[PDB]
């Protein structure tokens, strides 16, 4: 205690060359990192036409959790399940001359963009989930309007990766329920009511609101200062 002493460093300008500080704000990031960040920035700095930026409204966390909880009860067959079904079907129809009906009618989430679009056009879909992060957005921009025209309840949900985990893929970009079981029919009706309250009933209003137009941090501060000076005086 008497041998050690306090020697505070003067980290001001011109003394005691600066200590190591968190410079992550100033990191010269790789070109791909800078490009993806600046693309995300530009997509909101520009004025986003109302057909886009309807995807900035995603299902809230609780309704999304309920939706994926319901959809997880209708996962499509895996490789092992399909192999087991194929064995239990072939080895049964061969012995008993069955009409390939040794398996029950399947209830699975419908996925695939073309398949789901055709189901929407044929009014088979009872609940369509559209991923909010389809990188070429033209694939799903018409989907809210197609669902609205065909009277199909649709929800813009966060995660094509989440829909992929729903359908045993990496990504699915869509997920649809056309037929639901009796024990989940009431849950489907309540979920569809909430989803229509959030997306389908608001479509005619969100169709007239342009997105984006959001300034950066420093431009926002500058405009706040100029409004505080010129406007409030």
């Amino acid at each position: 205690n008497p041998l050690t002493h306090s020697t505070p460093k003067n980290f001001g300008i011109g003394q005691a060359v600066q200590p190591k500080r968190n410079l992550s704000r100033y990191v010269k990031w790789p070109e791909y990192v800078r490009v993806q960040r600046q693309k995300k920035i530009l997509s909101i700095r520009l004025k986003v036409p109302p057909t886009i930026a309807q995807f900035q409204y995603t299902l809230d966390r609780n309704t999304a959790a309920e939706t994926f909880k319901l959809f997880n009860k209708y996962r499509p067959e895996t490789a092992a399940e399909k192999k087991e079904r194929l064995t239990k079907e072939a080895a049964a129809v061969a012995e008993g001359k069955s009409k390939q009906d040794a398996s029950p009618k399947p209830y699975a989430v419908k996925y695939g963009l073309n398949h789901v679009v055709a189901l929407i056009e044929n009014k088979k879909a009872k609940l369509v989930l559209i991923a909010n992060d389809v990188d070429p957005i033209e694939l799903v921009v018409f989907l809210p309007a197609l669902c609205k025209k065909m009277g199909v309840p649709y929800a813009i949900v966060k995660g094509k990766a989440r829909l992929g985990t729903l359908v045993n893929q990496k990504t699915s970009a869509v997920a649809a329920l056309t037929e639901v079981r009796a024990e989940d029919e009431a849950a489907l009706a309540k979920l569809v009511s909430t989803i229509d309250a959030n997306f389908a009933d608001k479509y005619d209003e969100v169709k007239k609101h342009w997105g984006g137009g959001i300034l950066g941090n420093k431009a926002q501060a500058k405009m706040d200062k100029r409004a505080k000076n010129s406007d409030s005086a």
């Binding site: 968190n22 992550s24 010269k28 990031w29």
Partner: protein
């Protein structure tokens, strides 16, 4: 995302460099020794000057492979003739072949070695 990274320079992250595990051999037969003793030492040089060197200076004069260096010449002389080599001097002759003056240690008589290997 929330790490400190006290430097503003971003360098390429270190990643695993697996060693090669080929599904087939590249050559399928290792080449035999391209420079063994029998072609490192091509033949003795038997000019009058070379024979005088053999008789007097305890120096064997050989024509050697143009690819062979002093280590290879010394090793080949030691293996082929069972003699320790004191020193190897090499030159490229005007005719494009390599000449080696191999001075053996004092324990060996280059004249006796030459007589043993057939040239006197």
């Amino acid at each position: 995302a929330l790490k400190v990274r006290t430097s503003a320079t971003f360098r390429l992250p270190k990643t695993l460099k697996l060693a090669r595990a080929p599904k087939y051999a590249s050559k399928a037969v290792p080449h035999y020794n391209r420079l063994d003793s029998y072609k490192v030492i091509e033949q003795p040089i038997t000019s009058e000057t070379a024979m005088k060197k053999v008789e007097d200076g305890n120096i064997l004069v050989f024509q050697v492979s143009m690819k062979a260096n002093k280590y290879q010449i010394k090793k080949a002389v030691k293996e082929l003739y069972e003699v320790d080599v004191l020193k190897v001097n090499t030159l490229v002759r005007p005719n494009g072949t390599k000449k080696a003056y191999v001075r053996l240690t004092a324990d060996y008589d280059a004249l006796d070695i030459a007589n043993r290997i057939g040239y006197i």
